[PDB]
Design a protein around this ligand. Sequence first.
Ligand SMILES: CC(C)[C@H](NC(=O)[C@H](Cc1ccccc1)C[C@H](O)[C@H](Cc1ccccc1)NC(=O)OC(C)(C)C)c1ncc[nH]1
Ligand SMILES: CC(C)[C@H](NC(=O)[C@H](Cc1ccccc1)C[C@H](O)[C@H](Cc1ccccc1)NC(=O)OC(C)(C)C)c1ncc[nH]1
Lengths: 99, 99
Amino acid sequence: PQFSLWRRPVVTAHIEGQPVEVLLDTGADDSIVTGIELGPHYTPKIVGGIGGFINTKEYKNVKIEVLGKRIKGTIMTGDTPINIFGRNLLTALGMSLNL
Amino acid sequence: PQFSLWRRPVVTAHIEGQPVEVLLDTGADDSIVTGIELGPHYTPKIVGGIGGFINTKEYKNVKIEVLGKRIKGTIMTGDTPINIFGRNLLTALGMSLNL
Ligand SMILES: CC(C)[C@H](NC(=O)[C@H](Cc1ccccc1)C[C@H](O)[C@H](Cc1ccccc1)NC(=O)OC(C)(C)C)c1ncc[nH]1
Ligand SMILES: CC(C)[C@H](NC(=O)[C@H](Cc1ccccc1)C[C@H](O)[C@H](Cc1ccccc1)NC(=O)OC(C)(C)C)c1ncc[nH]1
């Protein structure tokens, strides 16, 4: 599809069956979400942005369904004020920025 | 053009004469640059990032040249880890996000 950017590109995705709305972020390296419980097998991390750093819980090989595609990829869960899908999940779907 | 998001979409902008590497960001409602100072006539703002709230200096009608275009926009200066061109300049340039 084409997101023209006059509204925030918010899309509904299913992460291991849970339904969540996420912002398609070209400015983020990772996809950080909150509100899904994915289990005790994570690698602890810390990522930065406008306002400072945040501790994350990284999970690899996660079943993701977003925009008619189904991919497997790394999602981080943490206290992020906005759910985000960064370039690691946008490249898996083959999305791109066009001029 | 098309940017495939495998590498961070950073380009060169010349904000009112001055050269700056900026990140093409769809997750951003505004554009915030650091390391340039645009002057005393600004309106203070607060915007929220991932680590929390920052204060920015907002300058309206800033002439910009990115890719082959000469546009005018609102640029904010503040404490960002990376210079970002958000949805207000991307729509001005006419860029889209596609799958
Ligand atoms: C939530 C994350 C995905 C996103 N942050 C990033 O993409 C940031 C952008 C950034 C660039 C340069 C310095 C600091 C931060 C990247 C992550 O913080 C850091 C970058 C970094 C490296 C070394 C020390 C400190 C930071 N990278 C990261 O976590 O993952 C990689 C893929 C590079 C290993 C962000 N963008 C906007 C708001 N938050
Ligand atoms: C470049 C900044 C503006 C950007 N922040 C935003 O886009 C933020 C965050 C956001 C993104 C997506 C969905 C909801 C909220 C919106 C801005 O913070 C705020 C909205 C807001 C203000 C006060 C309290 C709460 C929200 N917008 C803003 O200052 O600019 C306008 C002119 C649109 C009002 C950011 N920081 C890190 C990544 N993106």
